[PDB]
Amino acid sequence: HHSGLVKMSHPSGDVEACMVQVTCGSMTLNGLWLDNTVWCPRHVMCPADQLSDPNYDALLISMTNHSFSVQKHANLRVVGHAMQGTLLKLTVDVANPSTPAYTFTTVKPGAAFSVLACYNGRPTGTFTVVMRPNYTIKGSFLCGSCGSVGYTKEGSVINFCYMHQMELANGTHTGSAFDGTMYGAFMDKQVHQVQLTDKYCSVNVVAWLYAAILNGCAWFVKPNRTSVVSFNEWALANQFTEFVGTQSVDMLAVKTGVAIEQLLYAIQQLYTGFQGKQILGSTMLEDEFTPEDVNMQIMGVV
Amino acid sequence: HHSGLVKMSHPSGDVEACMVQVTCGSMTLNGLWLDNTVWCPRHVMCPADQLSDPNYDALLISMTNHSFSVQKHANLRVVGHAMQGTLLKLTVDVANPSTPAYTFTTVKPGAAFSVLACYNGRPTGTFTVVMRPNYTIKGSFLCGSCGSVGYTKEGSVINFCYMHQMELANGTHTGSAFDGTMYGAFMDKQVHQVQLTDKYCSVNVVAWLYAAILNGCAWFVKPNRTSVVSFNEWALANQFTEFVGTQSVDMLAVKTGVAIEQLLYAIQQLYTGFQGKQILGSTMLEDEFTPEDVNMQIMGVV
Numbered sequence: 290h291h292s293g294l295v296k297m298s299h300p301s302g303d304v305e306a307c308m309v310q311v312t313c314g315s316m317t318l319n320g321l322w323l324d325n326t327v328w329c330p331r332h333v334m335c336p337a338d339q340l341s342d343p344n345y346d347a348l349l350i351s352m353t354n355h356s357f358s359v360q361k362h363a364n365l366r367v368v369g370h371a372m373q374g375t376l377l378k379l380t381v382d383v384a385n386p387s388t389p390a391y392t393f394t395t396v397k398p399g400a401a402f403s404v405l406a407c408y409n410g411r412p413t414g415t416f417t418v419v420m421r422p423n424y425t426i427k428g429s430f431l432c433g434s435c436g437s438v439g440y441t442k443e444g445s446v447i448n449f450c451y452m453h454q455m456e457l458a459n460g461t462h463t464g465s466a467f468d469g470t471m472y473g474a475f476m477d478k479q480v481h482q483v484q485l486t487d488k489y490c491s492v493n494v495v496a497w498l499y500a501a502i503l504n505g506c507a508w509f510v511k512p513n514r515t516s517v518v519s520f521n522e523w524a525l526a527n528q529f530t531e532f533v534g535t536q537s538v539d540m541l542a543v544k545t546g547v548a549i550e551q552l553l554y555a556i557q558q559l560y561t562g563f564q565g566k567q568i569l570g571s572t573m574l575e576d577e578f579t580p581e582d583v584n585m586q587i588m589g590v591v
Numbered sequence: 592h593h594s595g596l597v598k599m600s601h602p603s604g605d606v607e608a609c610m611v612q613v614t615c616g617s618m619t620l621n622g623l624w625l626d627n628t629v630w631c632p633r634h635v636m637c638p639a640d641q642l643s644d645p646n647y648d649a650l651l652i653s654m655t656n657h658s659f660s661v662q663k664h665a666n667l668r669v670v671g672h673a674m675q676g677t678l679l680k681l682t683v684d685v686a687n688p689s690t691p692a693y694t695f696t697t698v699k700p701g702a703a704f705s706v707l708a709c710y711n712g713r714p715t716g717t718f719t720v721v722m723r724p725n726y727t728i729k730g731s732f733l734c735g736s737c738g739s740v741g742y743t744k745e746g747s748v749i750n751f752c753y754m755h756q757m758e759l760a761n762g763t764h765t766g767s768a769f770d771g772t773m774y775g776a777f778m779d780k781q782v783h784q785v786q787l788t789d790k791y792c793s794v795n796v797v798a799w800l801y802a803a804i805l806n807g808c809a810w811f812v813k814p815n816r817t818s819v820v821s822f823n824e825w826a827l828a829n830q831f832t833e834f835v836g837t838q839s840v841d842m843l844a845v846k847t848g849v850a851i852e853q854l855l856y857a858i859q860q861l862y863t864g865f866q867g868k869q870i871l872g873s874t875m876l877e878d879e880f881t882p883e884d885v886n887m888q889i890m891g892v893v
């Protein structure tokens with residue numbers, strides 16, 4: 290029995306019209322064109338021989354309005370350049386006519402957002418990722434994918450929350466929010482950086498367990514319950530994130546009739562082993578589906 | 592170590608502009624607007640009390656050009672209606688100005704295509720699925736999602752290959768190609784239909800095994816080899832599809848330096864059990880990634 294859950298990505302047509310190509314000399318990447326402002330990663334100015342320890346402040350001063358090349362596949366003239374954190378704020382004389390209603394937001398561990406992967410300013414693919422507790426993502430990025438934007442949708446408003454900056458040694462990826470701050474303790478330099486531990490998202494696993502009940506799989510459900518305070522103490526020593534209930538989780542509980550504390554008890558025993566049984570065709574707990582994802586994809590609740 | 596493979600979907604901006612809402616009385620669904628032709632599932636005309644065994648030929652004759660309502664969220668007037676297979680060919684007086692270069696094609700088991708899920712003519716999400724050997728897909732569809740289109744991209748040309756029609760008892764989904772034929776032996780009627788067995792795609796599993804070698808995971812590789820003819824005979828009695836090599840598979844073999852026949856031997860022994868080890872963080876063989884997907888996402892080869 291298929292669960293009915295897939296890695297669902299927001300329609301990217303609105304974001305596609307905001308993609309531009311930014312060239313600052315020997316390197317090119319992607320930029321986000323909203324109104325008269327073009328956002329792009331700040332390491333575009335860096336020469337290839339100085340990628341390990343850039344001095345970005347000196348590089349920015351060395352730049353000139355005419356030395357930024359913005360092209361849409363239409364060529365954009367730069368009338369103002371500024372730096373905020375690990376991002377460049379380039380001003381252009383032409384405002385994007387296809388600018389959607391948008392906000393800037395910071396995504397949190399356990400939350401999912403859609404990513405529009407681009408190369409040379411041309412979108413190539415889209416996918417959805419969940420921001421891991423170590424503030425990395427398990428994406429698919431290659432050379433030239435920097436400037437690809439991660440976003441969430443709330444109605445007709447697009448909340449941009451991610452811009453790809455680097456790939457880690459373990460194959461994961463990390464970027465920066467649109468306030469200039471990279472997620473986690475990572476810095477946009479071509480050096481090895483200490484990566485925090487990754488943890489199972491308790492909120493997402495409970496949502497995944499609830500989706501099993503919504504598909505007829507409830508062999509793991511027992512009337513025994515574990516309190517949120519007891520589960521959180523257990524989670525601290527088992528690489529599990531502390532569980533924080535939300536209204537979305539409550540709807541799954543009220544629909545299925547299974548208490549969250551019942552599932553938290555199940556998570557503790559399912560962690561020790563599935564004992565040869567399967568849930569949703571899987572032998573391991575899944576934290577890649579948010580409670581919202583189960584809410585919309587299964588019951589059509591947004 | 593993350594593999595670097597995600598469920599990547601084609602950018603859906605081109606297809607989004609081709610989505611319309613088709614209403615034929617008490618039921619509404621989604622339609623594909625290309626040139627002066629609107630395609631939609633044929634059960635839109637059916638009344639809710641006759642969904643189990645429609646007589647579509649009689650229903651079509653009972654219809655009138657004015658009785659089809661096409662709306663884009665712009666209202667389209669219907670000047671011609673015709674039926675081909677399980678699809679309706681509605682002609683409209685206005686050609687879609689955003690019509691992309693497109694072709695109609697039939698997708699095969701083991702191949703992957705992108706799906707734009709829509710409701711009331713408004714796209715809601717996108718995802719990629721692999722057509723299973725039983726000619727079903729493991730999608731995420733709900734009531735009103737019929738008319739959502741599956742497509743592949745070859746350059747700037749979009750090859751439409753799927754239109755959602757129904758959900759099966761096991762939670763999977765099936766649709767029809769744009770020649771009117773449903774995939775597999777399924778018929779667009781609200782009755783239980785016999786579903787063929789599902790099988791592991793040998794081509795996709797070999798691609799998944801190759802991706803492990805490209806990420807440093809090669810514990811399963813042994814110099815022992817199994818010929819394609821011997822593996823195919825083995826596959827016939829183990830719910831595995833017969834393996835057919837392609838140029839895409841050859842590139843992975845030539846890059847990794849591992850023969851395909853070496854992997855086919857590995858598949859036979861990995862089927863009997865992973866013996867407590869993991870590949871790409873999984874304890875089961877994955878056939879949801881095509882050789883092309885590994886080619887583009889890992890090595891940037893399209």
Ligand SMILES: *[C@@H](O)[C@H](C[C@@H]1CCNC1=O)NC(=O)[C@H](CC(C)C)NC(=O)OCC(C)(C)Sc1ccc(F)cc1
Nearest residue numbers: 332430431432433435454455456458477478479480481
């Ligand atoms: C976008 O331009 C690009 C995206 C990556 C290319 C390969 N895969 C990607 O996702 N980012 C960079 O080129 C980036 C630029 C720096 C100024 C931040 N370099 C980078 O992070 O390269 C990835 C490395 C694995 C090389 S970082 C690393 C890790 C260990 C180590 F020992 C040295 C460097």
Ligand SMILES: *[C@@H](O)[C@H](C[C@@H]1CCNC1=O)NC(=O)[C@H](CC(C)C)NC(=O)OCC(C)(C)Sc1ccc(F)cc1
Nearest residue numbers: 634732733734735737756757758760779780781782783
């Ligand atoms: C699009 O209008 C819609 C898509 C499905 C709605 C629920 N999930 C979907 O993906 N398709 C239908 O409404 C479709 C129309 C028929 C004329 C083909 N009905 C349909 O296939 O419903 C799904 C069922 C599970 C009800 S089929 C079935 C299976 C076993 C059984 F015993 C009876 C009916």
